[PDB]
Design a binder for this molecule. Structure first.
Ligand SMILES: [Cl-]
Ligand SMILES: [Cl-]
Ligand SMILES: [Cl-]
Ligand SMILES: [Cl-]
Length: 129
């Protein structure tokens, strides 16, 4: 599923990501834009042989099991493939754990390099939320 910007904003808000650990909704939308282009089916191999999955590009070394990442923790206790559903529930639940790990949203490279420090509210502008 490729989400519309406001569509994703509404789904993330419904799932309680808006202001979660202090990160306003535009932060999450901005992160999803640059991680996945709002595409639930996005997958990307990392240098270390791990792969990032879904709208928030959740990694197979720590968070989900993909069956091919040596040393996998699966701290979210899910198959990585569950993170590719058109229903974002598993991705959000897992993202809540990630953002609570101590580094906040800095865990998302794309957030740190493309969203942090910018007018992230722009990402929810026009949305009926
Ligand atoms: Cl867009
Ligand atoms: Cl915002
Ligand atoms: Cl959803
Ligand atoms: Cl980046």
């Amino acid at each position: 599923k490729v989400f519309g910007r406001c569509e994703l904003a509404a789904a993330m808000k419904r799932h309680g990501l808006d202001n979660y650990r202090g990160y306003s909704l535009g932060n999450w939308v901005c992160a999803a834009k640059f991680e996945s282009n709002f595409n639930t089916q996005a997958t990307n191999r990392n240098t270390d042989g791990s792969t990032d999955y879904g709208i928030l590009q959740i990694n197979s070394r720590w968070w989900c099991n993909d069956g091919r990442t040596p040393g996998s923790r699966n701290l979210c206790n899910i198959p990585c493939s569950a993170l590719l559903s058109s229903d974002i529930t598993a991705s959000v639940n897992c993202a809540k754990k990630i953002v609570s790990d101590g580094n906040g949203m800095n865990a998302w490279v794309a957030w740190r390099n493309r969203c942090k420090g910018t007018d992230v509210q722009a990402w929810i502008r026009g949305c009926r939320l």
